[PDB]
Amino acid sequence: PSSPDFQPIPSFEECFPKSTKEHKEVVHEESGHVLKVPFRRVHLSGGEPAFDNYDTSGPQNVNAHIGLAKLRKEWIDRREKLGTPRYTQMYYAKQGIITEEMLYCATREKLDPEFVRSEVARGRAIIPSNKKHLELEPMIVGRKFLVKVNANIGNSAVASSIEEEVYKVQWATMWGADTIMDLSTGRHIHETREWILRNSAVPVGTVPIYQALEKVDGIAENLNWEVFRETLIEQAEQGVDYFTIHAGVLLRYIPLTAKRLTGIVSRGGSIHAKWCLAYHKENFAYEHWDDILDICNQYDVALSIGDGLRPGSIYDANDTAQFAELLTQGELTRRAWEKDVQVMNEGPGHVPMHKIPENMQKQLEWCNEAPFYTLGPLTTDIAPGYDHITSAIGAANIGALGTALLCYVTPKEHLGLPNRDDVKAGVIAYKIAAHAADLAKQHPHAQAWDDALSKARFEFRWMDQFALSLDPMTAMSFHDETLPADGAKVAHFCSMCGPKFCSMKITEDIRKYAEENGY
Amino acid sequence: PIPSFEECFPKSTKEHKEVVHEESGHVLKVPFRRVHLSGGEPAFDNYDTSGPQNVNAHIGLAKLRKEWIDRREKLGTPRYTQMYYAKQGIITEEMLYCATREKLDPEFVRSEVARGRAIIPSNKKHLELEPMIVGRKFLVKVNANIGNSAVASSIEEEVYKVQWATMWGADTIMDLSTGRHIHETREWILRNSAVPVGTVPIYQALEKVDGIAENLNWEVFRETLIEQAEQGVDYFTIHAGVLLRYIPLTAKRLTGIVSRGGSIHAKWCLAYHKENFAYEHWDDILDICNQYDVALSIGDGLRPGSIYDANDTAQFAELLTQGELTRRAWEKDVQVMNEGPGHVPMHKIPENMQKQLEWCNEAPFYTLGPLTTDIAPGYDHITSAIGAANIGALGTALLCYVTPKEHLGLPNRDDVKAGVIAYKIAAHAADLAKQHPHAQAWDDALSKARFEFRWMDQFALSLDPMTAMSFHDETLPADGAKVAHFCSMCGPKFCSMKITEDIRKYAEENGY
Numbered sequence A: 001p002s003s004p005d006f007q008p009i010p011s012f013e014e015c016f017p018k019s020t021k022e023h024k025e026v027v028h029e030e031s032g033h034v035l036k037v038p039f040r041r042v043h044l045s046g047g048e049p050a051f052d053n054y055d056t057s058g059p060q061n062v063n064a065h066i067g068l069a070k071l072r073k074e075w076i077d078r079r080e081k082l083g084t085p086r087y088t089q090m091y092y093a094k095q096g097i098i099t100e101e102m103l104y105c106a107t108r109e110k111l112d113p114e115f116v117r118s119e120v121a122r123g124r125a126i127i128p129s130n131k132k133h134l135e136l137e138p139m140i141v142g143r144k145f146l147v148k149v150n151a152n153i154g155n156s157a158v159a160s161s162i163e164e165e166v167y168k169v170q171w172a173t174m175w176g177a178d179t180i181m182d183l184s185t186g187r188h189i190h191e192t193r194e195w196i197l198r199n200s201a202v203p204v205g206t207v208p209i210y211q212a213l214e215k216v217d218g219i220a221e222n223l224n225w226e227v228f229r230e231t232l233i234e235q236a237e238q239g240v241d242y243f244t245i246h247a248g249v250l251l252r253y254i255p256l257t258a259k260r261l262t263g264i265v266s267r268g269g270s271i272h273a274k275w276c277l278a279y280h281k282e283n284f285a286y287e288h289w290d291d292i293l294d295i296c297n298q299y300d301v302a303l304s305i306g307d308g309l310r311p312g313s314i315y316d317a318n319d320t321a322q323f324a325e326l327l328t329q330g331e332l333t334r335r336a337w338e339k340d341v342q343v344m345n346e347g348p349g350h351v352p353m354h355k356i357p358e359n360m361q362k363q364l365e366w367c368n369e370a371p372f373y374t375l376g377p378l379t380t381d382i383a384p385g386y387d388h389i390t391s392a393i394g395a396a397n398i399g400a401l402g403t404a405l406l407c408y409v410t411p412k413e414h415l416g417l418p419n420r421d422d423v424k425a426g427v428i429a430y431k432i433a434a435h436a437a438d439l440a441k442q443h444p445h446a447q448a449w450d451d452a453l454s455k456a457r458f459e460f461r462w463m464d465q466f467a468l469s470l471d472p473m474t475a476m477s478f479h480d481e482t483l484p485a486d487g488a489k490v491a492h493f494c495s496m497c498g499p500k501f502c503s504m505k506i507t508e509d510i511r512k513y514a515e516e517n518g519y
Numbered sequence B: 001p002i003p004s005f006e007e008c009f010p011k012s013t014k015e016h017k018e019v020v021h022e023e024s025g026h027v028l029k030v031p032f033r034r035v036h037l038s039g040g041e042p043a044f045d046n047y048d049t050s051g052p053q054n055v056n057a058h059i060g061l062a063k064l065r066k067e068w069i070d071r072r073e074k075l076g077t078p079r080y081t082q083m084y085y086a087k088q089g090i091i092t093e094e095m096l097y098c099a100t101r102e103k104l105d106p107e108f109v110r111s112e113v114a115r116g117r118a119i120i121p122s123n124k125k126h127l128e129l130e131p132m133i134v135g136r137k138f139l140v141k142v143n144a145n146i147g148n149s150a151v152a153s154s155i156e157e158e159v160y161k162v163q164w165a166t167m168w169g170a171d172t173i174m175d176l177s178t179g180r181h182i183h184e185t186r187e188w189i190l191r192n193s194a195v196p197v198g199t200v201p202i203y204q205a206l207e208k209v210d211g212i213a214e215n216l217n218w219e220v221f222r223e224t225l226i227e228q229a230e231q232g233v234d235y236f237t238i239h240a241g242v243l244l245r246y247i248p249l250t251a252k253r254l255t256g257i258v259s260r261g262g263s264i265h266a267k268w269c270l271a272y273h274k275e276n277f278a279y280e281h282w283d284d285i286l287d288i289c290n291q292y293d294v295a296l297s298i299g300d301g302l303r304p305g306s307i308y309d310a311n312d313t314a315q316f317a318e319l320l321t322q323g324e325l326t327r328r329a330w331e332k333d334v335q336v337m338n339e340g341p342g343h344v345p346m347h348k349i350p351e352n353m354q355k356q357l358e359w360c361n362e363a364p365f366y367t368l369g370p371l372t373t374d375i376a377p378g379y380d381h382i383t384s385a386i387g388a389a390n391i392g393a394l395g396t397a398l399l400c401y402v403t404p405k406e407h408l409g410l411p412n413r414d415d416v417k418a419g420v421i422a423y424k425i426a427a428h429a430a431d432l433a434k435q436h437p438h439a440q441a442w443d444d445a446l447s448k449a450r451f452e453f454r455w456m457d458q459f460a461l462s463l464d465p466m467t468a469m470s471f472h473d474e475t476l477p478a479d480g481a482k483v484a485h486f487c488s489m490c491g492p493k494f495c496s497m498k499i500t501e502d503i504r505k506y507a508e509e510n511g512y
């Protein structure tokens, strides 16, 4: 058991000048529980109304040893007292019950609680919310809601540490990660995840087969259902909100990967496949799917059905292996719904832009509109070091088509373990992709953000412009590289055009002239 | 002086494909870049915009087009544009050079140029130019904007930035200087640029009258055109579509007129209640352009500067007029492209392409992004890469880059590189989406290197080799790690491609 030397992340005020953390109090009628739903408020100058935005940053300045407040405790205890055969949001929704989690999400999304219940009940949205993750501020994932972003963190045998991964969780959520996954493959996996869960206000996912492999000393041939099952229960008891499980990597699909350029690039999927060939046996997660469901519906662990046969190169995009798995993902989805287990489906991968629409169309149909969860896609293989940009293109496009959760890709993809700077870069790039998708879907009020920043830009309220942005101190420091003076924060120009050539200032002149003399 | 070609692209060599222009016997040396790989893999040949290396800026590049131009002059001709020659059935040195660079038929190039669907920006005074073509049927091209302002930068910094931009893949540049020494700065750039150089003549015209738009007139504008055309400027952005009657259509806009040239014209028009003097003198402008072969980039002075303003009346009014000006320009054999948006949300991008294709008779489209959202100043190379890739996939021929300093200040050399890398990504992603021939060969080569753990090959094949390598080396710096079947992301036990090796080894022996 390590004694990590934790470093506090920069403060909320440092990251978001002129912002405050706020909460909307709403009362859950059936229980009388009071919910405090987070949002962030940007205070503007010149008498503009304050701008309210989503807030994933969670409780601030909490000592890691103490952990976040357990805000969901009285919800869980009351539902436990009332007695129930299943504990998932889907079960409650199908009973016609609007839970605290549903009301919370509804408020957070500014939609009707009954609409939220309906979407969860039909399986088109999920609320990943293990009853052991009491610290969680509930959120919803689904095509009819804001496009969400996941940040992957975790150590490897080669790099990082508990204190660095706890920093990265707090940092990822500060910049807007809606979920995280702890993908640790090194030492102290159980400990690392514990620290993260007790200090994360967003859902935390894992890939259980990683730790299962770590337990059998990295020898895949020594995996079996017993060790996998033990791992599922361990992680469920900690509070993991969703599991990526590669139960679609069937024995008969593995030969389909033989002629691929980059083979099987899924970590989990390659592990399952190796085990399958070694024994010529069927995927033990597939074989024990029912047993897995019986675990998940007692804790409410959502299942993220993995795509072990996702393409790892443009060359392999939309090939037979990938779509063979997708078909099976749909089967597993329907089976999970029978047991009231919440499901999302994992998708590609490396996919050129003209092949992206086929991916969405097939998933929507074959998986009956379960939420889709994509890694990018990366639209080209040529730019390692910049794969947050290559994949932002694909993420935005497939987001516009209905993808509900975008798994980020950092500048270090294909190169090494991301550090804290890489985590921020990835989150910012994917917040851009997710918001651009919200706009393309004409999601209600999404453009208000753009309009507020653009108004500040035209009116030369520079500090307002910075404060309204995704990353205020970056915008400001960039501006200030050439015009550092306080006075330049009210200039009707910047260094790009200078005072004589600033088009918005010239537009001010034009409108002044027209106001007096007409057009 | 900029980092060397070898420092930027390890294992790469600059090469040239030699071809002979039959009608003249002139020998053309068409550049390309070859990445030398390990393990017996064939070398990968890529496009190369970097131009002649290690030439001192005070000396300037060799004047490779001199004999081309001198001969065409001797032979006598009423017009000097690639469109005029193409329409005469002539395949010029520039067209053959382009065909060779694009790996396409010289006759196809001539056909595209003659119908106005592609342009070869190639002022006969820019003798240093290595010809390139802009058009939907060709590789998607990228433009880098550079230049000083009254507030920042200098002649040396801007000359650096032009060499730097082209090093990383800029296919054209524009010198948008609005500060001191505009004429001299542009001279240095033109003499040292192997790629087409564009300008916006109205900027220097305004500088000539000390920043007072009301003191502009046709005379000072025409003097500027002649001055810039004599230096060798390959294309002019001219906002002749900002008509007097369109200005009131911008009154309700959230961010008004964001075009620099556009706002200047609109101010002048309102001041005098007179029609745009570039519009009024369009015929005169064409009479200048077809003697130098200065291509015209018809500006979109009324582009949207916010998501709110996207695809509004003002924008489309100007687009209709751009089509008119395009057809008129073609009548005088002036090569034309049309400038486009702007700030446009993704669901509105398809309409932009559809309407430009129809209303402007398929002239090459030249977009600024577009930016798909306003929320992330500091990252507008990414917000706009999304838009650029998408509108490129629909047929946009030239993508004007957007740097991380957009809306914030004058980009520096780092920002220029970031801008070019982001846009080379967008351009290539568009090439793949268009299924442009051999486009995926690049991706396939790097991905093969990735799967076989030829790490140095992977780095060498990429858009920015040293960034890739330095990123990898942050956690695994030893030379030995360059042949490891893992990296620090997964480690030895969890690397999926190494596990795939194991899977295939097992199948090779025992079957599937």
Ligand SMILES: Nc1ncnc2c1ncn2[C@@H]1O[C@H](CSCC[C@H](N)C(=O)O)[C@@H](O)[C@H]1O
Residues within 6 Å of the ligand: A152, A153, A154, A155, A156, A183, A184, A185, A265, A266, A267, A311, A312, A349, A350, A375, A408, A409, A413, A414, A417, A418, B489, B490, B496
């Ligand atoms: N510890 C960690 N921290 C952050 N991301 C991780 C991680 N472990 C795995 N990942 C993510 O999961 C991927 C698996 S390793 C290589 C996957 C491959 N590039 C592909 O296309 O799927 C990584 O590329 C990264 O996206």
Ligand SMILES: Nc1ncnc2c1ncn2[C@@H]1O[C@H](CSCC[C@H](N)C(=O)O)[C@@H](O)[C@H]1O
Residues within 6 Å of the ligand: A496, A497, A503, B145, B146, B147, B148, B149, B176, B177, B178, B258, B259, B260, B304, B305, B342, B343, B368, B401, B402, B406, B407, B410, B411
């Ligand atoms: N000197 C220079 N160096 C690099 N880019 C320049 C430049 N001068 C102008 N530009 C480009 O031209 C633009 C004009 S100023 C503002 C334009 C506005 N943001 C819009 O959406 O169109 C700049 O934002 C930048 O993209």
Ligand SMILES: O=P(O)(O)OC[C@H]1O[C@@H](n2ccnc2)[C@H](O)[C@@H]1O
Residues within 6 Å of the ligand: A152, A181, A183, A207, A244, A265, A266, A267, A268, A269, A304, A306, A307, A308, A310, A346, A347, A348, A349, A373, A374, A375, A407
């Ligand atoms: O084990 P594999 O590589 O499949 O999973 C790596 C990561 O990628 C995520 N992902 C998302 C879509 N496809 C894969 C997955 O949830 C996990 O975060």
Ligand SMILES: O=P(O)(O)OC[C@H]1O[C@@H](n2ccnc2)[C@H](O)[C@@H]1O
Residues within 6 Å of the ligand: B145, B174, B176, B200, B237, B258, B259, B260, B261, B262, B297, B299, B300, B301, B303, B339, B340, B341, B342, B366, B367, B368, B400
């Ligand atoms: O004067 P304005 O702002 O129109 O032009 C600014 C820059 O933007 C470029 N551009 C490209 C498409 N629309 C505008 C134009 O060629 C020049 O590089």
Ligand code: SF4
Residues within 6 Å of the ligand: A492, A493, A494, A495, A496, A497, A498, A501, A502, A503, A504, A505, B406, B407, B408, B409
């Ligand atoms: S000077 Fe140019 S870039 Fe700066 S605020 Fe004005 S219009 Fe925008």
Ligand code: SF4
Residues within 6 Å of the ligand: A413, A414, A415, A416, B485, B486, B487, B488, B489, B490, B491, B494, B495, B496, B497, B498
């Ligand atoms: S360890 Fe993971 S990221 Fe690194 S080479 Fe192997 S598969 Fe790629």
Ligand SMILES: [Cl-]
Residues within 6 Å of the ligand: A413, A414, A415, B450
């Ligand atoms: Cl990889």
Ligand SMILES: [Cl-]
Residues within 6 Å of the ligand: A457, B406, B407, B408
């Ligand atoms: Cl601006």
Ligand SMILES: [Zn+2]
Residues within 6 Å of the ligand: A265, A312, A350, A414
């Ligand atoms: Zn990959």
Ligand SMILES: [Zn+2]
Residues within 6 Å of the ligand: B258, B305, B343, B407
């Ligand atoms: Zn702009």
